[PDB]
Design a protein around this nucleic acid. Structure first.
Ligand SMILES: [Mg+2]
Ligand SMILES: [Mg+2]
Ligand SMILES: [Mg+2]
Ligand SMILES: [Mg+2]
Ligand SMILES: [Mg+2]
Ligand SMILES: [Mg+2]
Ligand SMILES: [Mg+2]
Ligand SMILES: [Mg+2]
Ligand SMILES: [Mg+2]
Ligand SMILES: [Mg+2]
Ligand SMILES: [Mg+2]
Ligand SMILES: [Mg+2]
Ligand SMILES: [Mg+2]
Ligand SMILES: [Mg+2]
Ligand SMILES: [Mg+2]
Ligand SMILES: [Mg+2]
Ligand SMILES: [Mg+2]
Ligand SMILES: [Zn+2]
Ligand SMILES: [Zn+2]
Lengths: 86, 117, 55, 77, 169, 190, 292, 49
RNA sequence: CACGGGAAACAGCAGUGAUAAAAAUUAAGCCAUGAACGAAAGUUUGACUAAGUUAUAUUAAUUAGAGUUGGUAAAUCUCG
RNA sequence: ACAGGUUUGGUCCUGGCCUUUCUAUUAAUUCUUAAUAAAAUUACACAUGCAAGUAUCCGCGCCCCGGUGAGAAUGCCCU
């Protein structure tokens, strides 16, 4: 558990690394701040004039758990339980 | 459920809590239970005077007269209420009971002045 | 409604016809029907007692 | 409540209803009130019946219903 | 959901978000396509992607596929009048087929918005009853009124026991 | 407690700053329970009369803490900073009595503007505002009203013809009741 | 043809004066938070998103209607003297039908006195809230609108919140809507706090109120100390539109005054404090010309 | 007369549509005629039309 | 199923035997709602209203007792 | 599920069982007062009382309400 954990946290990709490898502006949309486009990262070096190819339907691996969560099929009496502070 | 007969009726369904009554004005079949199934809810009547000294009655007048327009019979307190609103003429018994009350007040006034002596 | 195994109740029809027949045959003459006891104010046929205001 | 085939009580057997004492004046005034009232309410009810007639026929065979029909058929072709 | 090639399309969200709503004339849609050729491509993609979306919002419309019957891909719509719409889809993209079909027999956003507007006037804010159908149950819960006695026990006088115990004596 | 009328004072005191530091009041307190998951509601009340029960809450172990609508420094701790929602009692570890007390107090303080919360942007209630319509604007009073007459003729008590009263006296005879005259115009009090 | 709040001239002047601050317009809100979303954009797409957010902020900036006070409703629909001593309380009959506009609903009251009369304004609104609830409205009027609570909220400079609270709670033509809006304007005037309402949808409210009450002083001083003189001259201009015949408007017609000189004209002819205005205009002019 | 509220409703309603006539709205009782209870009812079954 | 036949019916309110780990009043009113009948005053209604009973559950205070203390899992000392 | 205990001399894996949460009945031990809610072993047998009448006669009502879950995969939704 801890080896796997530290590996997974070490493998993190910073917004800056992403910005730099795609050469694009990575822009965050808060739900509480509405449509306002906060720019988190900018690609130091030369920005692209090429837009990202738009995929109508994306191909991503999905976990049946997250999907079951989103659609409210998780009824577990253990999940919603109130616990003490962090 | 299927019945033999009976009519469309606008009445008072008793919603409520012990010593605290409330009424849902309701378009119902006549033979189904009081608080039970209904065709449509019309309005609501709060018997108890609130903070401002008010009994609140809400009436959906469009649908009320749609249903009376379909030949729905009114209950006596429904009648009394519509007449109190001025949507209907005052029910004769409102007026008659008003008179009976006035005469009771008169005879109690005289009895008061007779007992004082 | 319709379920494929539904049973054919015969005696429903029989009771219907038989009751209609025994209704028409035993149908009371209105002579005995509205017949009245004037002392008790009581119909013999219906066992009904008449209204006071009608006495 | 009781049933058609449920026999009536032994105590309720020899009893029939006793009508109230009639105050002639007030009674008469009342009868008039009710006739007037019921006449009025009858007129109102017929008013409302007419209303329902109108609204139903207009929402069925009326102007914009026909407009909808023709326009939709047109767009279709 | 894990299994499948494009698992996202088995998601409730993806199915909901596909927008085509047939007119009430449409009963049957028949897709006839090919499993080979470069031209038939878009048609295949259509069958693979939007057919599920479509059918989800048009639950009562029969949809049927036929593979490698005709040398060319096409749609056929069967209406209530007996009218047969034949839509040739050949070198057309997936999206183009969808937009073209939505064009022919769709429902204008006006139509749909009016429909949902009629469905949203069905629940009336002023009524009282079950939490399922109504915003409120008692009128105990409306601010200025008298409270549910199971929250705030009533003054002795408004109690029927006190009134009866008074009329008795 | 000496503070009383001025609760906020204690939160600015040096003994408070000494004891709790800059962390919340409840941050160090831990709830003892039978298993991995705590009971879904905390203990009811931790002080019964003179007896203070076991390991007491954050709030009720320190008596100089006062729950009012007034001291916003105390109440702040029991509201989320970012989400502006009140924590449930298990989260903090307060006893049920005091959790309810806190909820009510925070309510009164938000109603007195002493505590910040989200006030959303709403449109006007009406689309078009016109006092024109006959509902809001005065109507041209009926010919019955301008005179001072009952809205319908039969609202007023009218004495019946004597032949009709005698006919009724013949119908209901022996079942009869004392005839009643006109109603008194206005009704007097006791 | 007396100038109104909704006149395109007044609207454009006040939209201009308000200003778009996308950071104050769109601010983190105390509602429940969900994890942020990320997308990869060109400079182009970023510009597009920015402009859309701007339009949304325009919609956000839409002004609350200012109406003069409504006239008290007294109308008696009937009197039945027969019903005089029958009830201790009053019956309130609200027409609830979903199609009817809320200005057009029939709210009637049977009194104990027997008179069938129309409901007053407060009872009418209270009843509409009861039967057609919309969020933000307490049926009983909130404690926060007492003078003590309002003063406390002013001390914490919550004025924008006070105005939103009043907007949702009361009605634009009501007595308390106007009472509170005006009292608030009065305090932002007393304290020189105007910048609080700057990018707010609430700016043109105090704008119009200050033009109609003829105190432009603190707002001009403020606008010029913020180094915005285009807004100060748009403001004097607005003063001239809403006071067409007056010594400053006529003298600005005469002198053919350019914007800065228009502010000088108004400084001279009308404004209660000309010393502060001319000194601040002096300072701004000299300092700005020397710096740039 | 119309009952007071119903009357007011009619008035406001025609006022909305630009009808200025102040002519009093009147309830027509012609078909509101009812027989007294003494009037004998027909025992003959109704022919449905 | 109900012509017929067993046979003599509380699965209306109260009750009672039997049975089960399983235990509400053989109670008061039609005053309010609803229903029936009446042209109507009105009458009837164990529906229902208001009460009686019971820690079954919430809540409020006047009210202190139960369980547990090797680990999971909060908490122990001396004897037998 | 935010999980935890338990296989072995020991580790890892696989894999059950149990613990921790919530509700309802019953039982045991304890029990001061109110209010509200709810009242539930039994389609076995039932003493007694009451539960449908109104109305100038005709008539109109009289498992409608109320009861129960025995039966039937019965059925939900929709024509
Ligand atoms: Mg109850
Ligand atoms: Mg009879
Ligand atoms: Mg029983
Ligand atoms: Mg029975
Ligand atoms: Mg027994
Ligand atoms: Mg016992
Ligand atoms: Mg009754
Ligand atoms: Mg009665
Ligand atoms: Mg009784
Ligand atoms: Mg208990
Ligand atoms: Mg395990
Ligand atoms: Mg092993
Ligand atoms: Mg071992
Ligand atoms: Mg027990
Ligand atoms: Mg029990
Ligand atoms: Mg049932
Ligand atoms: Mg079977
Ligand atoms: Zn309640
Ligand atoms: Zn505590």
């Amino acid at each position: 558990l801890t080896r796997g954990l530290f590996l997974g946290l070490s493998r993190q990709e910073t917004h800056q690394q992403l910005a730099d490898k795609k050469s694009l502006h990575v822009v965050e949309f808060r739900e509480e701040c509405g449509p306002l486009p906060i720019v988190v990262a900018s690609p130091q070096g030369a920005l692209r004039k090429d837009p990202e190819p738009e995929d109508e339907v994306p191909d991503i691996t999905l976990d049946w758990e997250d999907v079951k969560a989103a659609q409210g099929m998780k009824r577990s009496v253990w999940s919603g339980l109130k616990r003490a502070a962090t | 459920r299927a019945y033999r007969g009976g009519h469309l009726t606008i009445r008072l369904a008793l919603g409520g809590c012990t010593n605290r009554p409330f009424y849902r004005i309701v378009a119902a079949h006549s033979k189904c239970p009081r608080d039970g199934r209904f065709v449509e809810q019309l309005g609501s009547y709060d018997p108890l005077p609130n903070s401002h000294g008010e009994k609140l009655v809400a009436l959906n007048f469009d649908r009320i007269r749609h249903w009376i327009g379909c030949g729905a019979h009114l209950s006596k307190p429904v009648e009394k209420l519509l007449g109190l609103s001025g949507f209907y003429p005052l029910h004769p018994m409102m007026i008659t009971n008003a008179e009976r009350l006035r005469r009771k007040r008169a005879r109690e006034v005289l009895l008061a002045s007779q007992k004082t002596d | 409604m319709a379920r494929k195994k539904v049973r054919p109740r015969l005696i429903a029809e029989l009771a219907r016809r038989v009751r209609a027949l025994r209704e028409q045959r035993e149908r009371p003459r209105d002579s005995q029907r509205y017949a009245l006891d004037y002392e008790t104010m009581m119909r013999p046929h219906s066992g009904n007692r008449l209204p006071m205001r009608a006495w | 409540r009781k049933t058609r085939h449920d026999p009536p009580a032994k105590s309720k057997a020899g009893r029939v209803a006793t009508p109230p004492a009639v105050d002639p004046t007030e009674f008469f005034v009342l009868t008039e009130r009710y006739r007037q009232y019921r006449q009025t309410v009858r007129a109102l009810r017929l008013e409302f019946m007419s209303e329902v007639r109108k609204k139903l026929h207009e929402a069925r065979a009326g102007v914009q219903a026909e407009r909808k029909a023709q326009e939709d058929a047109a767009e279709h072709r | 959901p894990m299994k499948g090639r494009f698992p996202i399309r088995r998601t409730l969200q993806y199915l909901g978000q596909g927008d085509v709503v047939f007119k009430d004339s449409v009963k049957v849609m028949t897709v006839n396509y090919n499993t080979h050729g470069e031209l038939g491509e878009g048609a295949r993609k259509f069958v693979f992607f939007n057919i599920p979306q479509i059918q989800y919002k048009n639950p009562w419309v029969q949809i049927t596929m036929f593979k490698n019957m005709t040398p060319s891909p096409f749609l056929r719509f069967y209406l209530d009048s007996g009218e047969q719409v034949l839509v040739d889809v050949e070198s057309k993209s997936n999206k183009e087929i969808v937009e073209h079909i939505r064009k022919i027999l769709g429902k204008n956003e006006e139509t749909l918005e009016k429909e949902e507007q009629e469905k949203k006037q069905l629940s009336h804010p002023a009524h009282f009853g079950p939490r399922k159908y109504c915003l409120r149950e008692c009128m105990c819960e409306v601010e200025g009124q008298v409270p549910c006695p199971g929250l705030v026990p009533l003054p002795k006088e408004m109690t029927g026991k006190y009134k009866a115990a008074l009329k008795a004596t | 407690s000496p503070y009383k009328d001025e609760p906020w004072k204690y939160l600015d005191s040096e003994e408070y700053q000494n004891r709790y530091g800059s962390r919340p009041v409840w941050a160090d307190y831990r709830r003892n329970h039978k298993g991995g998951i705590p009971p879904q509601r905390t203990r009811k009340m931790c002080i019964r009369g003179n007896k203070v029960a076991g390991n007491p809450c954050p709030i009720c172990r320190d008596q100089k803490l006062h729950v009012d609508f007034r001291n916003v420094k105390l109440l702040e701790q029991f509201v989320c900073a970012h989400t502006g929602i009140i924590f449930h009692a298990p989260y903090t570890g307060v006893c049920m009595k005091q959790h309810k007390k806190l909820t009510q107090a925070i309510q009164k303080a938000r109603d007195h503007g002493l505590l910040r919360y989200h006030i959303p942007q709403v449109e006007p209630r009406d689309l078009d505002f016109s006092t024109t319509h006959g509902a809001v604007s005065s109507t041209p009073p009926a010919p019955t009203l301008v005179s001072g007459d009952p809205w319908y003729p039969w609202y007023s008590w009218k004495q019946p013809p004597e032949r009709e009263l005698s006919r009724l006296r013949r119908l209901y005879q022996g079942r009869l009741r004392e005839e009643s005259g006109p109603p008194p115009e206005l009704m007097p009090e006791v | 043809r007396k100038p109104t709040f909704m006149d395109e001239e007044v609207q454009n002047i006040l939209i201009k004066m308000t200003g778009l601050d996308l950071q104050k317009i769109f601010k983190p809100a105390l509602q429940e938070l969900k994890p942020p979303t990320y997308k990869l954009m060109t400079q182009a797409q970023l510009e597009e998103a920015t402009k859309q957010a701007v339009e949304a902020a325009k919609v956000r900036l839409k002004m609350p209607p200012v109406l003069e006070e409504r006239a008290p409703i007294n109308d008696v629909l009937a009197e039945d003297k027969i019903l005089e001593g029958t009830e201790t309380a009053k019956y309130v009959f609200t027409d609830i039908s979903y199609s009817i506009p809320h200005r057009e609903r029939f709210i009637v009251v049977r009194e104990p006195s027997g008179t069938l009369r129309k409901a007053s304004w407060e009872e009418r609104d209270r009843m509409i809230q009861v039967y057609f609830p919309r969020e933000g409205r307490r049926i009983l009027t909130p404690v926060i609108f007492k003078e003590e609570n309002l003063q406390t909220m002013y001390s914490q400079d919550q004025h924008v919140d006070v105005l939103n609270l009043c907007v949702a709670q009361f009605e634009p033509d009501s007595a308390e809507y106007i009472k509170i809006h005006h009292h608030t304007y009065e305090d932002i005037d007393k304290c020189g706090k105007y910048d609080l309402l700057r990018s707010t949808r609430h700016f043109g409210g105090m704008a119009w109120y200050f033009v109609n009450k003829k105190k432009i002083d603190g707002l001009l001083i403020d606008q010029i100390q913020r180094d915005l003189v285009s807004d100060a001259t748009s403001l004097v201009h607005l003063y001239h539109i809403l006071h067409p015949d007056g010594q400053s408007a006529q003298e600005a017609k005469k002198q053919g005054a350019e914007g800065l000189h228009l502010i000088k004209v108004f400084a001279k002819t009308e404004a209660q404090k000309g010393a502060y205005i001319e000194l601040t205009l002096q300072a701004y002019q000299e300092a700005f010309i020397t710096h740039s | 007369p119309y009952p007071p509220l119903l009357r007011a409703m009619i008035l406001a309603q025609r006022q909305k549509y630009g009808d200025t006539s102040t002519e009093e709205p009147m309830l027509n009782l012609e078909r509101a005629r009812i027989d007294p209870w003494d009037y004998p009812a027909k025992l003959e079954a109704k022919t449905k039309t």
